[PDB]
UniProtKB/Swiss-Prot annotation, chain A:
Name of the protein in question: Large ribosomal subunit protein uL18
Species of origin: Escherichia coli (strain K12)
One GO location term (cellular component): cytosol
Domain of life where this protein originates: Bacteria
InterPro entries named in the record: Ribosomal_uL18_bac-type (IPR004389), Ribosomal_uL18_bac/euk (IPR005484)
This protein's domain notes: The basic N-terminus is not necessary for binding to 5S rRNA. It is however required for cooperative binding of L5 and L18 to 5S rRNA as well as for binding of the 5S rRNA/L5/L18 complex to the 23S rRNA.
Segments traversing the membrane: none
Stored PANTHER family: 39S RIBOSOMAL PROTEIN L18, MITOCHONDRIAL, LARGE RIBOSOMAL SUBUNIT PROTEIN UL18M
Origin organism lineage: Bacteria, Pseudomonadati, Pseudomonadota, Gammaproteobacteria, Enterobacterales
Gene3D superfamilies: 3.30.420.100
GO MF, one example: structural constituent of ribosome
Gene coding for it: rplR
Keywords from the UniProt entry: Phosphoprotein, Ribonucleoprotein, Ribosomal protein, RNA-binding, rRNA-binding
GO biological process, one term: cytoplasmic translation
Swiss-Prot record, chain B:
Domain of life from the UniProt record: Bacteria
GO cellular component terms, A-Z: cytoplasm; cytosol; cytosolic large ribosomal subunit
Subunit text: Part of the 50S ribosomal subunit; part of the 5S rRNA/L5/L18/L25 subcomplex. Contacts the 5S rRNA; cross-links to the P site tRNA. Forms a bridge to the 30S subunit in the 70S ribosome, contacting protein S13 and S19.
Residue(s) carrying N6-acetyllysine: K1
Assigned keywords, A-Z: Acetylation, Ribonucleoprotein, Ribosomal protein, RNA-binding, rRNA-binding, tRNA-binding
Protein's name in the database: Large ribosomal subunit protein uL5
Note: Identified as a multicopy suppressor of the slow growth phenotype of an rsgA (yjeQ) deletion mutant.
Species annotation: Escherichia coli (strain K12)
Gene: rplE
Swiss-Prot record, chain C:
Gene from which this protein is expressed: rplP
Lineage of producing organism: Bacteria, Pseudomonadati, Pseudomonadota, Gammaproteobacteria, Enterobacterales
Keywords, in A-Z order: Hydroxylation, Methylation, Ribonucleoprotein, Ribosomal protein, RNA-binding, rRNA-binding, tRNA-binding
Record's subunit section: Part of the 50S ribosomal subunit. Cross-links to the A and P site tRNAs. Interacts with assembly factor DarP(YjgA).
Protein name: Large ribosomal subunit protein uL16
GO cellular component: cytoplasm; cytosolic large ribosomal subunit
Post-translational modification (3R)-3-hydroxyarginine, affected residues: R79
PROSITE patterns: RIBOSOMAL_L16_1 (PS00586), RIBOSOMAL_L16_2 (PS00701)
Family: Belongs to the universal ribosomal protein uL16 family.
Source organism per UniProt: Escherichia coli (strain K12)
Any one of the GO BP annotations: cytoplasmic translation
Post-translational events: Is hydroxylated on Arg-79 by RoxA. The modification is nearly suppressed when E.coli is grown in anoxia.
GO molecular function: rRNA binding; structural constituent of ribosome; tRNA binding
UniProtKB/Swiss-Prot annotation, chain E:
Protein name, as recorded: Large ribosomal subunit protein bL25
Function field: This is one of the proteins that binds to the 5S RNA in the ribosome where it forms part of the central protuberance. Binds to the 5S rRNA independently of L5 and L18. Not required for binding of the 5S rRNA/L5/L18 subcomplex to 23S rRNA.
TM annotation in the entry: none
Family matches, as Gene3D superfamilies: Ribosomal Protein L25, Chain P
Family as reported in the entry's similarity comment: Belongs to the bacterial ribosomal protein bL25 family.
Domain of life: Bacteria
Annotated keywords: Ribonucleoprotein, Ribosomal protein, RNA-binding, rRNA-binding
Assembly, per entry: Part of the 50S ribosomal subunit; part of the 5S rRNA/L5/L18/L25 subcomplex. Contacts the 5S rRNA.
GO CC, alphabetical: cytoplasm; cytosol; cytosolic large ribosomal subunit
Amino acid sequence: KKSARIRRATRARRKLQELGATRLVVHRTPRHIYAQVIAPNGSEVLVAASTVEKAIAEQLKYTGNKDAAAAVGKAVAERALEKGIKDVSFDRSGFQYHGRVQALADAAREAGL
Amino acid sequence: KLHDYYKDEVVKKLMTEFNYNSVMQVPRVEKITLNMGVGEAIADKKLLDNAAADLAAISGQKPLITKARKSVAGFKIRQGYPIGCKVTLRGERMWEFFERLITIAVPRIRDFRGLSAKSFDGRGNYSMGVREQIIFPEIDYDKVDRVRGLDITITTTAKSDEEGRALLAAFDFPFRK
Amino acid sequence: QPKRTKFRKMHKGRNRGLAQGTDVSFGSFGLKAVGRGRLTARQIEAARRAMTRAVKRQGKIWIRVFPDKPITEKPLAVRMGKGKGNVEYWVALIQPGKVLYEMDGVPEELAREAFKLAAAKLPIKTTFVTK
Amino acid sequence: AHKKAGGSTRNGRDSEAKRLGVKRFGGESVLAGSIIVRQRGTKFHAGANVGCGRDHTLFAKADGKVKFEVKGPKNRKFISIEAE
Amino acid sequence: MFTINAEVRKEQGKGASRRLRAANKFPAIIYGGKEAPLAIELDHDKVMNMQAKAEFYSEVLTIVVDGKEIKVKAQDVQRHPYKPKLQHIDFVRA
RNA sequence: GGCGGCCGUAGCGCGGUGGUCCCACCUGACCCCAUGCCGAACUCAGAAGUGAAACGCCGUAGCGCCGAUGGUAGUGUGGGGUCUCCCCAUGCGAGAGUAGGAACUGCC
RNA sequence: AUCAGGAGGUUAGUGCAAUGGCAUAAGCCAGCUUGACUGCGAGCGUGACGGCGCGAGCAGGUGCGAAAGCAGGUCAUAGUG
């Protein structure tokens, strides 16, 4: 078969769909950072939390740094464990290393994922 | 300084009395290419030294020596011969060299004209024509051997002869008819 | 005979050519021939040149089918040399109900006598059609 | 050096390919069929090729690619007996 | 306004068609937007001489099938090969 | 614009119109970080100016693709004659032609 | 010759006689690096028949990568006794 438009952009991952589990997409914005736990077959979002929502707790500083990306990971993951999910793979479509995505992943494990 | 007003103030005015359109298209960023004068022929293994040595004073960084693509054609060319040697970069630099270039030192040469012929005809890339002896405020008056004279270009995406050059004569003079 | 062409070797030239008549207006007349048959370029010229040499009154005479199927022959012994292109040049394939020569003309038929002369040159019983 | 004389392929021998893998009985995770080498994706029964369709069935065993762009090269999604 | 008689195509087939053509009869299909298409059996002799008249395709033909007219216009006519005759003609309600 | 469902008739082109809620452009590069030669890439920051390239809607079916109502040539299959050849029975029917879909649907 | 812009699924190129595959690519450029590892099985060649080859595991371990993963030489089919 040919390479779908998505495969050409290599943003997706078929190797994580062969397992039949969930993902941990990490959206990044020059103002905010977002994370989700979408499941196969469309865009089924079970749990998610934005850095802007972190303010609801008691956030003061900017929401576009590293320490903020780690705070969101603990929130999205905490809510995930409350849902019923245990395992999850990391899905960072295009990005560098040691960036905010790594801090997001390291935060997810800190919760229990 | 006197360079910011040309992309917010003196850009809408030159698009109202004789244009009647939108806001964009006239005139952006994108790097500006600065070519060098053919160094070939002049002399032998040299000149390249005094080169990049003077082209690194008016600006930053040093030019790179790149060759062509190994593909012999219907011309006298071997495989692996340094030719061209071009390096162009920007970001916010190509904005000041449009100030200290056409303000001081000119008029202040020795026999400057004032009237220029119609360079281009049906394009965007203008033209130029400077001699070998030039006097700049960013160059020593007595210590430079072999005077250098490089041209000056400017890339633009115009569609008609008019509607253009009206921005050039908005800071870069003289230019009589 | 499996239809043929070239993509092989160059043979003789066309004994035909002169389409004749003016093509500023496209008509829908013709001279159908009941029965399929292979006609060589030469015989096509004799028939075409027969009517054209008779329709001096006017023109508008045209042909749709042309020879595009070569046929090689072999004279002598045999054991080295598929086939060369000799007298047997290109040949046209005519269908049981195909229109060959059609002349743009309103009921004033002065070429029926011409088509008759040509109808006696091609190996196939042809019939005159008005539509 | 270069090629010449236009044409289709270039004549060979007798095709060497089969169609092993009933995929309706016991099936160890291995190449189900034989025609063209090099290909992955299918981990179970995924017989799906342009046409009236394709199919396979029953056999619990992780992974099980096909031959290549032939008998249903596409990769479906899981399948086993009925209750391994 | 040409008035032609006709029936309905019950045994739709090449075999049944040839038995009609031998008796001077050919099939035909009529359509008209919301109106459901209908296949009828027209007279060969009549239509043949009527279709020869150019106005045939411009008139509002009054085809009386079995016991009632329909009023339609000619579209295209499929002629027969070996024997110059009518094979099938299309019509449109007008 | 946010938030869902159905979930390859959402391939690919093309038109109108709306929200300063939103969003790319754009703008600025002090710093984290980064380009073999070029913060263009990469990454960070502010928001003067538009909608000229998103998105929300909504108007054409070109072309790709997926379905539906109508049928000649061609063709499956078994008997007939006939110089070749052609015919009949029977299951379909080239390809052309008439139409369906450019989203659909809930909420703030 | 080069450079800048536009059109351009691709007719380029990919070692080799051709077909098949491929473009945000298995193509090009640059950098880095080097799995052409060891041991032992199951399977594939209507119809039994060896060497050899290939696809696919397991056990222990080399290279690169974040990792999955990729190798049993050069995209596959001639270059051998």
